[PDB]
Amino acid sequence: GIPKVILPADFNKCSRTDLVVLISRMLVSLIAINENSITLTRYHSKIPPNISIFNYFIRLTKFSSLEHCVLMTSLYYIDLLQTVYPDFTLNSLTAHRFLLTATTVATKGLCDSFSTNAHYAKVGGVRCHELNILENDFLKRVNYRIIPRDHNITLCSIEQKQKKFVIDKNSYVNRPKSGYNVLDKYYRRIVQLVGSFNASPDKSRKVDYVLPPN
Amino acid sequence: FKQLEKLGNGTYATVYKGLNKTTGVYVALKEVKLSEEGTPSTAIREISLMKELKHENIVRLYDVIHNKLTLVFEFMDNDLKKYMDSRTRGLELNLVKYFQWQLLQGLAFCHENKILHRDLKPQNLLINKRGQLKLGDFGLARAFGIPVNTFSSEVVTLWYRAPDVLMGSRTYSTSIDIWSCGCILAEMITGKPLFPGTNDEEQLKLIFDIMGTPNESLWPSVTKLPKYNPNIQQRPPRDLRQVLQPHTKEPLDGNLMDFLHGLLQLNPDMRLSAKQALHHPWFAEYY
């Protein structure tokens, strides 16, 4: 027998401890798959850090006042970076450094209240400079296309530097909620996949998560 | 690019005029100081949103150049504030209308993509040698389509700030930009600024001396504003015509006046929308 908390439709009206368990769950599920299936990146650690993703994730949340939309954005930034930085895969060597980075770009990019990198580096465990070049890397690879919007990923992929081929490979109007439908789409997805207790980081929080069928 | 003259300043950026080395196209290079703060949040926000704002009435960002960071903006000659100084006096009313057309056109685009400029003033209304007006400097702007907790920001002047914002409001929507438009408008009409306040306190008083104090009756939302005062000396609204007319060479027609009142309601929800503004009888002859 295990608890069964029902979440709201709007992720903002929802406890951001719940989001930090939901995302962490999705993260190690990707980490398992992406691995159980090599030019290094800045998001690479020499060895897997001895702190689980969740325990690292709440920490960042508590001591840097990470807003909800930033937590959702962070998850989304995986799909972004994974689609436009060929070299980057999420895996137990990239999670942390990527997370630290994403988190603090989402906040500085999209929010009214934010800290300094020097504040973020301290909580995150890295030197300030470490975080500065780690922040700069991401922004270059993503081409500053950080606003989660329906066509954002595609437009980012298109805005990449393009190889010339012999044969060429071949407006948010009327679009619902002006194309700001991404973060809900992710919210609903993680409750659908890792919402139950069967994912991998069972240890973290013993709960089944529901989302009204609507 | 080869820099050829500084143009303005701030604590964020030093701006220069330069040239493309393929097309002779003139550009404004905006050098952003690149630090314990890392990559100036203000840049991440500007670069970010600009890519999202392509319109013939929003200054274009051409590229980004990377121990520094240069934002390459489409070079604009002067600005509404600087353009007016050159006369001396408000602009002639056919030109007043056109400029207010261009501003609302570009902003109507912002508001459609769910982005608030938040800091519209005549410096931020740049004007090229060809008479085109384009909104610029989206440093304080936000994509409000991302439901984050809103906190307002320190600005150099408050003359264009909505009364509710000055009353600590943190649930303001797209209506913050429409207030500034009604002030930009009065300015262009008269020559002098409508609410030339010195500080938080004075600006509000100066608004209420003309607009009347808030009408708790038809605006109940105001009692929830953090800086709200229930014990203000209640003032009757002064009719705008007798405030402007004395200092505008041409007669102010009814349409112009209804339009102006529509922008400068105290209650946000009573404020005209950019889309609605562009279909006011005042702009009929543009169709």
From Swiss-Prot, chain A:
Modified residues (Phosphoserine): 200
UniProt entry keywords in alphabetical sequence: Cyclin, Cytoplasm, Nucleus, Phosphoprotein
Keyword Ribonucleoprotein tagged: no
Record's protein name: PHO85 cyclin PHO80
Any one biological process term the GO annotation gives: negative regulation of transcription by RNA polymerase II
UniProt subcellular location: Cytoplasm; Nucleus
One MF annotation (Gene Ontology) recorded for this entry: protein kinase binding
Gene Ontology cellular-component terms listed: cyclin-dependent protein kinase holoenzyme complex; cytoplasm; nucleus; Pho85-Pho80 CDK-cyclin complex
Activity regulation, free text: Inhibited by the CDK inhibitor (CKI) PHO81 in response to phosphate starvation.
Complexes and interactors: Forms a cyclin-CDK complex with PHO85. PHO80-PHO85 forms a stable complex with its inhibitor PHO81 under both high- and low-phosphate conditions, but PHO81 only inhibits the kinase upon phosphate starvation. Interacts with transcription factor PHO4.
Main location: cytoplasm
Curated annotation (Swiss-Prot), chain B:
Domain Protein kinase intervals: 1-283
Effect of deleting the gene: Increases GCN4 level.
Other observations noted: Present with 6160 molecules/cell in log phase SD medium.
Reaction catalysis annotation: L-seryl-[protein] + ATP = O-phospho-L-seryl-[protein] + ADP + H(+); L-threonyl-[protein] + ATP = O-phospho-L-threonyl-[protein] + ADP + H(+)
Catalytic site positions: 119
SUPFAM superfamilies: Protein kinase-like (PK-like) (SSF56112)
Localization, UniProt: Cytoplasm; Nucleus
InterPro entries: CDK (IPR050108), Kinase-like_dom_sf (IPR011009), Prot_kinase_dom (IPR000719), Protein_kinase_ATP_BS (IPR017441), Ser/Thr_kinase_AS (IPR008271)
Organism listed in the record: Saccharomyces cerevisiae (strain ATCC 204508 / S288c)
EC number: 2.7.11.22
Protein activity control: Inhibited by the CDK inhibitor (CKI) PHO81 in response to phosphate starvation.
Sites annotated Not phosphorylated: 152-153
Protein known as: Cyclin-dependent protein kinase PHO85
Function: Cyclin-dependent protein kinase (CDK) catalytic subunit that regulates multiple cell cycle and metabolic processes in response to nutrient availability. Associates with different cyclins, that control kinase activity, substrate specificity and subcellular location of the kinase. Regulates metabolic processes when associated with PHO80 cyclin family members (PH080, PCL6, PCL7, PCL8 and PCL10), and cell cycle and morphogenesis processes when associated with PCL1,2 cyclin family members (PCL1, PCL2, CLG1, PCL5 and PCL9).
Presence of keyword Cell wall biogenesis/degradation: no
Main location: cytoplasm
Reported impact of residue 30 to R: Loss of kinase activity
GO MF entries: ATP binding; cyclin-dependent protein serine/threonine kinase activity; protein kinase activity; protein serine kinase activity
Keywords: ATP-binding, Cytoplasm, Isopeptide bond, Kinase, Nucleotide-binding, Nucleus, Phosphoprotein, Serine/threonine-protein kinase, Transferase, Ubl conjugation
Effect of residue 73 to G: Functional kinase, that can be rapidly inhibited by small, cell-permeable drugs like 1-Na PP1 (4-amino-1-tert-butyl-3-(1'-naphthyl)pyrazolo[3,4-d]pyrimidine)
Gene3D superfamilies per the UniProt record, alphabetical: Phosphorylase Kinase, domain 1 (3.30.200.20), Transferase(Phosphotransferase) domain 1 (1.10.510.10)
Disulfide bonds: none
Mutagenesis / variant outcome for changing residue 46 to A: Loss of kinase activity. Abolishes interaction to PHO80 and PCL1 cyclins
PTM remark: Phosphorylation of Tyr-12 seems to be important to discriminate between the different cyclin partners for binding.
Gene Ontology process terms (BP): cell cycle G1/S phase transition; DNA damage response; establishment or maintenance of cytoskeleton polarity; fungal-type cell wall organization; G1/S transition of mitotic cell cycle; lipid homeostasis; long-chain fatty acid metabolic process; negative regulation of calcium-mediated signaling
